[PDB]
Symmetry: C3
Subunit: 179 residues, 3 copies
Amino acid sequence: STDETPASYNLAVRRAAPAVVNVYNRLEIRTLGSGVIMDQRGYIITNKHVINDADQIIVALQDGRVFEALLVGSDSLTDLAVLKINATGGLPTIPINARRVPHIGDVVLAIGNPGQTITQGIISATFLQTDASINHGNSGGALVNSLGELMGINTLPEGIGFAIPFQLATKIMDKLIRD
Amino acid sequence: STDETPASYNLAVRRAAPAVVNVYNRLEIRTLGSGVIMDQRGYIITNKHVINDADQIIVALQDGRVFEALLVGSDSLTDLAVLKINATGGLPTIPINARRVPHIGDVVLAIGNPGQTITQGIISATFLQTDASINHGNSGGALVNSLGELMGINTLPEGIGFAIPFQLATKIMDKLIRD
Amino acid sequence: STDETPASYNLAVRRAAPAVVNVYNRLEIRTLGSGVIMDQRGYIITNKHVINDADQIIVALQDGRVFEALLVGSDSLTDLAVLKINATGGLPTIPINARRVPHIGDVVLAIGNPGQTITQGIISATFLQTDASINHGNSGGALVNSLGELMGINTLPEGIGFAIPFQLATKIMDKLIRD
Ligand SMILES: [Cl-]
Ligand SMILES: [Mg+2]
Ligand SMILES: [Mg+2]
Ligand SMILES: [Mg+2]
């Protein structure tokens, strides 16, 4: 068995896990939830709920770096929020594939922080429904396929989880950045 | 990543999902549960519990068609029921393989309607036990392997789900049709 | 579909399932939990909690054999315990690979007895965290990858399960055997 390799979804994790961060409040410090680094500019999606009633927002990467974050705006209807941080050289960004089409049955990992936690499941249906366990911390976290490509943003029917389609999430983010 | 394909169980879904239907009661209309189209003749398995206290039974396919259903009979012990609908040309039937032998560890999708929901898991043991989440709607629904072949009929120990072996379910159906 | 083979993790099950046993108390007979046969000498790991308040310990293999077990010792901090049974010829032992490195994302089956139950999931994080459902019986049971190699010992955050790393578990066992 030492020769053979164990079936795993590790590749996807290495690709997307660095992009997913912990979100915090701020002396008093509390843990709010998860978030995702979209682009180099330093824009980060997260849930509207974590941001609310936050005086100071803090973000923590998997490599150890720690930033102060600015609230770019939110969207009540989809429970989303965007944040901004000063973009150093070589920020870890969540892999995105605008071309990929999410089909029902696709393997999906859910990444967040109910430390960092990776659950597995499939696309139950396409709002997006999945049976990868979604708790309080991994809300605002990522949801990617086996390739690692972003498929959705976890949010908050037992055993049933909800993610916002990445394309829709992408569009919402662009508008918030604008408006 | 755009070149590579994401691991998925979509093939199985396309093969078996059309066969799985929504079951209803009937002005008043209520949602009862799930069901499975066995053959062209128009016989459909479902749980005994959904059928009980139903004045009018209605069935809804994934292509949009909608029928009035007749209760062929039930079986108290296994909580099963069979239904009949007028068979149009080219009814979607659940793939069955009498030859296939269900082994423990086999990948299995659970199909039903706690809209339509697909959960994933494995055969925990062979009554048949699985860790694909089973709620109220997907009871009466299908349980198929990766190939799409029917493995069991979901029914109603947290995290633990129960399906009736397809062979046994097949035999029960034949008898009800007779008796 | 009869030609093609359904994706499954059965191979792993046949390799590791014989090694996992049921643990019992003893006229009065009660079911305590699960356990794992480490080596030919007849040493078996299990949780500290099942052993406590046990007057007589009994072990049951998947081939039908049944032994009286001796408590080699326990470890309060890690909730572990080791047991001894007279080693007949050709005891089923849990496959171990000291060389294998558990990566996050690895497919993992959890084996125990909330009869014998096999749940599936992945390594959520490395204490070891997994989303293979862990109940009361499968505590003290095994946790192996797809190859079948031992990865951890299940123990007792919904949807989140904990296993003790096999290497650490191995070291603890050696010390208990000594001390
Ligand atoms: Cl699961
Ligand atoms: Mg899951
Ligand atoms: Mg499941
Ligand atoms: Mg699971």
